[PDB]
């Protein structure tokens, strides 16, 4: 199977500089082009630029030329895309994807990129309790608010798992403080609210922290 | 650069039911190297169809394309499912490869009212000399709705923020979490805390609330 596998999540200061790379396997490397693909949160997808890497033949978008360099060692089969000097709105999902007379016919999973001012720190998990403002005739709803953390994303789960029926996870707001906040929430039998423990298990992976908080009725 | 114009940049419709996606081109494209995209959230993009008309590997019968010179367009028969996502056009003529602005495809159901919950600031946040007021809006249809925060009946403005999940992939609902963030000083001055509520589905607006301390 045609394969492009890319590199980990980074987080970056403007002006700082950044290299990130797609492996491509499962195919002749050098026979197809590899194009870079960006796409601002909430965004629509923007070709950056393709490199042929049998000739290392390199055609950029108008846009993107001296804000990158597009390379490749067809060698070890992989591409690489790198900035000099990042700025906020270098903010992005970064997809690389294999280029022929089909379009682009395979993309990898793709690479975050996060560009602030701003310093990675984990986040405060408070509990959202459930009370009578939280229920609706015998339903209940309870969660967490998981604030003040840099960069995207979090993970959370409930109950280690094994409660997953009605949990919404909602996308986090960007605030002013340029730190991220999430809410995650699920809906219950107020019955059940008695009788079990709830407990949201969030794990901020680029802070390295990992919080179980326990959401108890008060 | 060519660019590409998407038609239309959303389309609510159900299950069973044809979409007809259109993309109009700033230029004549060869029809040998126009392209779709689809993409659902939280996932990379998957190629449909390519030269404007053949079928990618494993793409479905029901989706096909069509086009030539400056017009193209994307047609999906019976819509199931699995193809209420966004879809991009491509052109890859030019040395300059370039997308459509999108169209969001999503499902068309019964309205739904929002369960509205109200959760007040923990003891663990007030101890950090910050107070947080959630409000939830529960299983809502259309993604259409409206927040607003009262603070012993003063509208707040400024100071809080919102999101909204992704159709439910079960029952075809959204929901929403709104934040009202305030000082501990400021949370501890006032009283009542309100989240009103309006949406298509409710004949007026629902006010949950609160009471600092009761
Ligand atoms: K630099």
């Known amino acids: 199977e045609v394969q492009l596998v890319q590199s980990g999540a980074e987080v970056k200061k403007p002006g700082e500089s950044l290299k990130i790379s797609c492996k491509g396997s499962?195919?002749?490397?050098?026979?197809?082009?590899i194009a870079w693909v960006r796409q601002m949160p909430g965004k629509g997808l923007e070709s950056m630029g393709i490199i042929y890497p049998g000739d290392s033949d390199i055609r950029y978008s108008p846009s993107f030329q001296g804000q990158v360099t597009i390379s490749a060692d067809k060698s070890i089969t992989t591409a690489y895309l790198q900035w000099s000097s990042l700025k906020a709105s270098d903010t992005a999902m970064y997809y690389c994807?294999?280029?022929?007379?089909?379009?682009?016919?395979?993309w990898g999973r793709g690479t975050l990129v996060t560009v602030s001012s701003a310093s990675t720190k984990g986040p405060s998990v408070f509990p959202l309790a459930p009370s009578s403002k939280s229920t609706s005739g015998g339903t209940a709803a309870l969660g967490c608010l998981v604030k003040d953390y840099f960069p995207e994303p979090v993970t959370v789960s409930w109950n280690s798992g094994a409660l997953t029926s009605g949990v919404h996870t909602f996308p986090a707001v960007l605030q002013s403080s340029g730190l991220y906040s999430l809410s995650s929430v699920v809906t219950v039998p107020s019955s059940s609210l008695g009788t079990q423990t709830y407990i949201c298990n969030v794990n901020h992976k680029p802070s390295n922290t990992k919080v179980d908080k326990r959401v108890e009725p008060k | 650069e060519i660019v590409l114009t998407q038609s239309p940049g959303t389309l609510s419709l159900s299950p069973g039911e044809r979409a007809t996606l259109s993309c109009r081109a700033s230029?004549?494209?060869?029809?040998?190297?126009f392209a779709w995209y689809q993409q659902k959230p939280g996932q990379a993009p998957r190629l449909l169809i390519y030269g404007a008309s053949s079928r990618a590997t494993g793409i479905p019968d029901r989706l096909s394309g069509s086009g030539s010179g400056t017009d193209f367009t994307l047609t999906i028969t019976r819509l199931e499912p699995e193809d209420f996502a966004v879809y991009y056009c491509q052109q890859y003529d030019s040395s300059a490869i370039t997308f459509g602005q999108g169209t969001r495809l999503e499902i068309k159901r019964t309205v739904a009212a929002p369960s509205v919950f109200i959760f007040p600031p923990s003891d663990e946040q007030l101890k950090s000399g910050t107070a947080s007021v959630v409000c939830l809006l529960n299983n809502f249809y259309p993604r259409e709705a409206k927040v607003q925060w009262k603070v012993d009946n003063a509208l707040q403005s400024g100071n809080s923020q919102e999101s909204v999940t992704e159709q439910d992939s079960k029952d075809s609902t959204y929901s929403l979490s709104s934040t009202l963030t305030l000082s501990k000083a400021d949370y501890e001055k006032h009283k009542v805390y309100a989240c009103e509520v309006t949406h298509q589905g409710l004949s007026s607006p629902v006010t949950k609330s609160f009471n600092r301390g009761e």
């Open positions: 994807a294999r280029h022929d007379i089909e379009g682009f016919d395979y």
């Open positions: 499962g195919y002749i490397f050098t026979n197809y082009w």
């Open positions: 230029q004549s494209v060869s029809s040998s190297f």
